[PDB]
Amino acid sequence: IQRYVRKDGKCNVHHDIFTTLVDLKWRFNLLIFVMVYTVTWLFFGMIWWLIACVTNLNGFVSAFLFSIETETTIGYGYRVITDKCPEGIILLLIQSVLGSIVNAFMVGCMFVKISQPKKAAETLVFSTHAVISMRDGKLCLMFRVGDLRNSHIVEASIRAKLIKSKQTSEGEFIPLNQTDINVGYYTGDDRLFLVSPLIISHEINQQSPFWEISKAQLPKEELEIVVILEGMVEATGMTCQARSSYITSEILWGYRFTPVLTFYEVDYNSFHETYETSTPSLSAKELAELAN
Amino acid sequence: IQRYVRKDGKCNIFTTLVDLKWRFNLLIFVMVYTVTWLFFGMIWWLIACVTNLNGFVSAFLFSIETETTIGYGYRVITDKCPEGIILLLIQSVLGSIVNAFMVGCMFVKISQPKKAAETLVFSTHAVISMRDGKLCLMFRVGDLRNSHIVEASIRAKLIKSKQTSEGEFIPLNQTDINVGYYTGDDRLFLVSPLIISHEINQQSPFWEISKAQLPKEELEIVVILEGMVEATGMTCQARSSYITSEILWGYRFTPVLTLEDGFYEVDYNSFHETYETSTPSLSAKELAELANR
Amino acid sequence: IQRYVRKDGKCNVHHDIFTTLVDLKWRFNLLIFVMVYTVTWLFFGMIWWLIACVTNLNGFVSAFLFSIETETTIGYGYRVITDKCPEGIILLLIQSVLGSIVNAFMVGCMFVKISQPKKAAETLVFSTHAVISMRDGKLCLMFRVGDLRNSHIVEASIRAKLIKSKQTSEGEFIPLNQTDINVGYYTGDDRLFLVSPLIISHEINQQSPFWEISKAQLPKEELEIVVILEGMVEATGMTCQARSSYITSEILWGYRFTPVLTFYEVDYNSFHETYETSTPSLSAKELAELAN
Amino acid sequence: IQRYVRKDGKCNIFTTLVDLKWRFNLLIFVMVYTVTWLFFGMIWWLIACVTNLNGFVSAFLFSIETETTIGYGYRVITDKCPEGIILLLIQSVLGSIVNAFMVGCMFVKISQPKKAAETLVFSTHAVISMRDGKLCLMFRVGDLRNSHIVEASIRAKLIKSKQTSEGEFIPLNQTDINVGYYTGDDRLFLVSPLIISHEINQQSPFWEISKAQLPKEELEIVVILEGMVEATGMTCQARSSYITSEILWGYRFTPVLTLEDGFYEVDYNSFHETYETSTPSLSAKELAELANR
Ligand SMILES: [K+]
Ligand SMILES: [K+]
Ligand SMILES: [K+]
Ligand SMILES: [K+]
């Protein structure tokens, strides 16, 4: 049994032309466009030849240069239009109208491909390990988060899902039952502001799915913490998502994050790195019972 | 009377054009252009500045070649008149306005949020059965697309008539169904088709409704899903509705998740399918009293 | 002392070029554009005349037709470009680049003006009177809401502000102190779905600013209920706002809305109309005290 | 060390271009076009299909007239070569890509959300004083524009260092300041400049901080306001920051609202202004203990 979300953000789960085109390399992309235009010019060029209104046209090649010069609106005036036919005068209209729509679509896509905010999502980095340790009387599940590029994407919001197999009192099996892990939702502390990389901290309370799990129970647990971080880029109001996961073994008990902060200079080497201090090995449940 | 939202989610001067079908959208535009070319072509003829123009037809080819900015140079402009030099300006400016309406209509017609979430599907039925002691109304949602949805989120309303103690009748009362609102669990991480659960508690409009009352009842659950397309800046939306007959009592969804060679296989044939299980005939209210004693 | 928000949605309170242009009539709008283009053609036409590379140009008028034919990219070829000068060849570049930006800006605006969702906000209608009456044991402040056009804008969300003069224990005067009136926020019942016109219902509870006010107290009260309704149009994901107000005298005690529903045919005449039934004249506070 | 957000809200291949100043934005583009015209012009010369072309300069005017789609017809295309007929296609297609980047950069550069809320202003100072028994941190926000903001909403974070009982130091702890989140009162109806209030209760990071501690403290309040421009589909945003010295203790905002002939007059000179009032020297915590006994 392997994981459901990989550290980078791909799902290990199998099943708008714009959204097709964005996922395509420039190799393949440039190519869509050239074709889409040629096939219109081929199509319309063939209709001029079916119309033979035309000036200086001698072969197949001559009708092409016109079709293009008409649709692109160049019109050198070596190949002009006359009045002797009804059919050619009206084709030019249907062409120039359609030559507008096909253009708009292509530029719409061309923009959507370049506008895509998928690039900004790359510098968004998650810590490699999640750590459970004590923090102000309470046992806290913690992980780091931030951006590798300082300028853009400071505003964001974190959420976390917990995926585990489940069986109900009634016996129904829920394979990937997810429940939301509170990373600051009720307070508005999940609305992040990534000046620097921040430690996101889930407080292990009575509502926490980690309530009754101790240091010993932990590795003997088949759970996965999915982490979704979505933020708005600084130069553009366009927002992008970023995911990483944490399987059971990826969570270190008794550990605490290595502070990356030292003018303010941010040390990106220490980012993923963690250290352990003396931390109770007990479930947050039993710690709270003995606290009372 | 009928429903208000169909299974496919559809309900029962610029907006007018984007609401139209493509087939017509283009047809209107063709007219819209001809009528500008007719109008402006007629003004060139009223101006007769012109070169090689002989009849009505000749002024047209110019009007078009001017507005489309082709200009073959068989029909050029001279200087002898004031009127023609300035018309060309008013034409070329107005030729941008018309163009903008078209591209405007494009961008909008395509990037509408119904057309983005077309890959999001809702299960054909809702089901009412027991989950961990609580009676639950459930339906299934799923993305066929691998292109995930940013800030995906579920919500549902119940459209049923009701009457107050004071004798006030509300013909089409709407009360929101909780589908994870208070916990955050209504913000979906939607990869595998999820089974959304409304826990029929005290606050549920389904609190008092039993197995034998279910068919006799007259109501409509509307299910709405809004996120953002990961790749575009534009929103996606998926609606669906469950009328009283599509809400199966005492049934469960067939699991769509299987482990197949370092990957998990989702069977979308099983997506809609449901199976019957032993489930109480009482309302969630009446079960609460039984368990209370 | 008059109101702060008028029934239509204007504020009785005194104090991006796109947002300037949207508010302008087509009379004035068409006009901005024509000017913006002429002034570029005048400017660039004058630079061709400063350059005198040119073919068949005789007066001021001749340089204009070129400047236009170059910027609009027409180029009839009665006025072509030669090679004898460095200056003209490079101007054409600066023109065609700037002739792109000035165009883009104009079409950007032209779209933003037509795309404006201000029109859809018109058919959005509010009831003329707000009514306080009993509804399932509880005293409820109620008002109607809906769209005059059936097709578009069914999804919306209601919120309500309450504006009243205020003075703190410490003596600070807050002239237009607003507090949010719960019209279904905590439940998600404020997320409307306007199949038909709906009665929005504020439950007068211990949190309600109308808690301690009875039928007698009501007219002797200097309060205003601001009502913001914002919804997304059906054909376009573009969303628009719509406001109406309710001053103290606009709220009828003992009254209940006339049901507009009777296939389903919606009776838009009865929309604003209301009727009174036997309703307790007591503050929701004292009614709850005697209920216990 | 310095702040992270300035008073004006600004902090301390495509995104690279939209982040640039206009002056440069255009300059880059001029190059971007010349280098395409140079490149393609050189391919026409490598092709030498051409009419009236004599030197290097002649191939340029064509390359441009072809890419810009001008085409004067002094330099036309013939049929004798295969190579030239097909280059023109690759050129005219690639001439759209470059154009799209430019318009792309336009649309984006202008409709960025900082540039929309430029009319939203924040008060220069924050103030800490008493309101209806509760100690309150307040700041003022205001729209100079009459064009209102759809779904306007306030939020604030406090950037202060702290240390846990277990000896864990958090260099730049962020804890959200409540400015109406739980009630809905953080959704602003923003016409008149509002005085946003954080009630310094048990949950406030300012709970324990007194008058004499205030200056000695090292923290940063960040204030963020997001709504939508009523007229455009695009978002607007206003940031500002209040460093420890901009938070006046025991002060109050001067009222900006006056009744003047069937209308109300807002004085924006008074917007930023504050006045001192008798206010306790204790923390909101210590006042709570005094009142408790
Ligand atoms: K052209
Ligand atoms: K041309
Ligand atoms: K020509
Ligand atoms: K031409």
Swiss-Prot record, chains A, C:
<keyword id="KW-0851">Voltage-gated channel</keyword>
<feature type="topological domain" description="Extracellular">
    <location>
        <begin position="79"/>
        <end position="87"/>
    </location>
</feature>
<keyword id="KW-0406">Ion transport</keyword>
<comment type="function">
    <text>Inward rectifier potassium channels are characterized by a greater tendency to allow potassium to flow into the cell rather than out of it. Their voltage dependence is regulated by the concentration of extracellular potassium; as external potassium is raised, the voltage range of the channel opening shifts to more positive voltages. The inward rectification is mainly due to the blockage of outward current by internal magnesium. This potassium channel is controlled by G proteins. Forms a functional channel in association with KCNJ3/GIRK1.</text>
</comment>
<dbReference type="GO" id="GO:0042734">
    <property type="term" value="C:presynaptic membrane"/>
</dbReference>
<comment type="similarity">
    <text>Belongs to the inward rectifier-type potassium channel (TC 1.A.2.1) family. KCNJ6 subfamily.</text>
</comment>
<feature type="short sequence motif" description="Selectivity filter">
    <location>
        <begin position="73"/>
        <end position="78"/>
    </location>
</feature>
<feature type="topological domain" description="Cytoplasmic">
    <location>
        <begin position="110"/>
        <end position="292"/>
    </location>
</feature>
<dbReference type="GO" id="GO:0098793">
    <property type="term" value="C:presynapse"/>
</dbReference>
<dbReference type="GO" id="GO:0005267">
    <property type="term" value="F:potassium channel activity"/>
</dbReference>
<dbReference type="GO" id="GO:0016020">
    <property type="term" value="C:membrane"/>
</dbReference>
<feature type="intramembrane region" description="Pore-forming">
    <location>
        <begin position="72"/>
        <end position="78"/>
    </location>
</feature>
<keyword id="KW-0225">Disease variant</keyword>
<keyword id="KW-0812">Transmembrane</keyword>
<protein>
    <recommendedName>
        <fullName>G protein-activated inward rectifier potassium channel 2</fullName>
    </recommendedName>
</protein>
<dbReference type="GO" id="GO:0046676">
    <property type="term" value="P:negative regulation of insulin secretion"/>
</dbReference>
<keyword id="KW-1133">Transmembrane helix</keyword>
<feature type="intramembrane region" description="Helical; Pore-forming; Name=H5">
    <location>
        <begin position="60"/>
        <end position="71"/>
    </location>
</feature>
<keyword id="KW-0407">Ion channel</keyword>
<dbReference type="GO" id="GO:0015467">
    <property type="term" value="F:G-protein activated inward rectifier potassium channel activity"/>
</dbReference>
<feature type="transmembrane region" description="Helical; Name=M1">
    <location>
        <begin position="27"/>
        <end position="51"/>
    </location>
</feature>
<keyword id="KW-0597">Phosphoprotein</keyword>
<feature type="transmembrane region" description="Helical; Name=M2">
    <location>
        <begin position="88"/>
        <end position="109"/>
    </location>
</feature>
<keyword id="KW-0630">Potassium</keyword>
<feature type="site" description="Role in the control of polyamine-mediated channel gating and in the blocking by intracellular magnesium">
    <location>
        <position position="103"/>
    </location>
</feature>
<comment type="subunit">
    <text>Associates with KCNJ3/GIRK1to form a G-protein-activated heteromultimer pore-forming unit. Associates with KCNJ5/GRIK4 to form a G-protein-activated heteromultimer pore-forming unit. The resulting inward current is much larger. Interacts (via PDZ-binding motif) with SNX27 (via PDZ domain); the interaction is required when endocytosed to prevent degradation in lysosomes and promote recycling to the plasma membrane.</text>
</comment>
<dbReference type="GO" id="GO:0005242">
    <property type="term" value="F:inward rectifier potassium channel activity"/>
</dbReference>
<dbReference type="GO" id="GO:0098688">
    <property type="term" value="C:parallel fiber to Purkinje cell synapse"/>
</dbReference>
<dbReference type="GO" id="GO:0099508">
    <property type="term" value="F:voltage-gated monoatomic ion channel activity involved in regulation of presynaptic membrane potential"/>
</dbReference>
<keyword id="KW-0472">Membrane</keyword>
<dbReference type="GO" id="GO:1902937">
    <property type="term" value="C:inward rectifier potassium channel complex"/>
</dbReference>
<dbReference type="GO" id="GO:0098794">
    <property type="term" value="C:postsynapse"/>
</dbReference>
<keyword id="KW-0633">Potassium transport</keyword>
<keyword id="KW-0813">Transport</keyword>
